[PDB]
From Swiss-Prot, chains A, B:
Disruption phenotype: Cells lacking this gene display highest sensitivity to carbonyl stress. The yajL mutant (but not the parental strain) suffers from a 100-fold decrease in viability after incubation for 48 hours in LB medium containing 0.6% glucose, and the mutant is rescued by YajL- and DJ-1-overproducing plasmids. The wild-type strain displays a small quantity of glycated proteins after overnight culture in LB medium supplemented with 0.6% glucose, whereas the yajL mutant displays much higher levels of glycated proteins, and also higher DNA and RNA glycation levels. The lineage of its organism: Bacteria, Pseudomonadati, Pseudomonadota, Gammaproteobacteria, Enterobacterales. One of its GO terms (biological process) is protein repair. Its EC number is 3.1.2.-, 3.5.1.-, 3.5.1.124. The modification Cysteine sulfinic acid (-SO2H) is found at C105. The keyword DNA repair applies. This is Protein/nucleic acid deglycase 3. Pfam families: DJ-1_PfpI. It comes from Escherichia coli (strain K12). Keywords: Chaperone, DNA damage, DNA repair, Hydrolase, Oxidation, Stress response.
Length: 195, 195
């Protein structure tokens, strides 16, 4: 199967993390969750208090051959990612080895921009953090797929379905993305991959 | 200081549970999560494998004065609810005492219909299970609010935002629902409480 490494830190946005995980599993993707910036503790208290148990510490899975690394948002979770040298070097390694980096909400501006990971990539993120993304790189769009650098970005809790579906499309294919979308009772406006 | 009791079981649908909890917290509603696991275990494995910690076993919080009891879906989570005499008694007590019952996805057909808790009233649920909701009660709407019996129902993972926003309306009101909605970057097909 295709596989995904979903990172979690104290203060990660729980809808973004959980909805993404759920959709990837529905798509037949094996998902591992990794605890970041917790010195190995697998208990992760998210941004609105939801408490998740991660599968493993990042340091034990960072060298795995996952097809995508996923960075949920949440202000404080994204700061933890930014300030983790292991997280940043893992993101860089996924990219250099031809794999996908996927980031939502505050993660693009907080993690990718300060570390100059994708200096000329196109990206989106949470609208109120537009001023944290260099102006020439910013698109205000529910999902942005920059195929040149294999960078997938998205905007907020309410775009987590759109984000997860595009990961499925990229890793498994359009037909599987449509199958998953069809299970959800999605709002009008969200792309369902039928065409 | 409105409050919500969100029930969780092995096999609950994690998007439905977590997105609902998230939105209620954003709305200033005090949330308590209650495990309906038969042994009282609080470390719940949800339908796609997300590991979610409940705050308390149902028996320790069921008699609380929460304004709403929330039943997430997930095929096996809803079966656990149906087969828990304490859960069913608690739902009945919320209803008889003039409080709100909120249920999504499989929870209406699996829990409410077999126990005949709402013999009169409109309801929805996951559309593949529509033939398990009595025909005179069924509506095919993203959210159904029947104020006559204080029953809120909704259809699936993709309607979790609509569901959570309606709980906010019912507990805190339209202004707060609009405020929360405006945070999410949600899709155009979800009612946003602005006129
Ligand atoms: Cl441990
Ligand atoms: Cl670690
Ligand atoms: Cl670049
Ligand atoms: Cl959504
Ligand atoms: Cl399910
Ligand atoms: Mg620059
Ligand atoms: Mg394609
Ligand atoms: Mg009847």
């Amino acid at each position: 199967s295709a596989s995904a490494l979903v990172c979690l830190a104290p203060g990660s946005e729980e809808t973004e993390a959980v909805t993404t995980i759920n959709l990837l599993v529905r798509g037949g993707i094996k998902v591992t969750t990794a605890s970041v910036a917790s010195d190995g503790n697998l208990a992760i208290t998210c941004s609105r208090g939801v408490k998740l148990l991660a599968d493993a510490p990042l340091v034990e899975v960072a060298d795995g051959e996952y097809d995508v690394i996923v960075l949920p948002g949440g202000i404080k979770g994204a700061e933890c990612f930014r300030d983790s040298t292991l997280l940043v070097e893992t993101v860089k390694q996924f990219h250099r080895s031809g794999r996908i980096v996927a980031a939502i909400c505050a993660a693009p501006a907080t993690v990718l921009v300060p570390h100059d990971i994708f200096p000329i990539g196109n990206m989106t993120g949470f609208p109120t953090l537009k001023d944290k993304i260099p102006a020439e790189q910013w698109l205000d769009k529910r999902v942005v797929w920059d195929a040149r650098v294999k960078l997938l970005t998205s905007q907020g809790p309410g775009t987590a379905i759109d984000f997860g579906l595009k990961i499925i499309d990229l890793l498994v294919g359009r037909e599987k993305a449509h199958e998953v979308a069809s299970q959800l009772v999605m709002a009008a406006g969200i792309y369902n991959y039928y065409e």
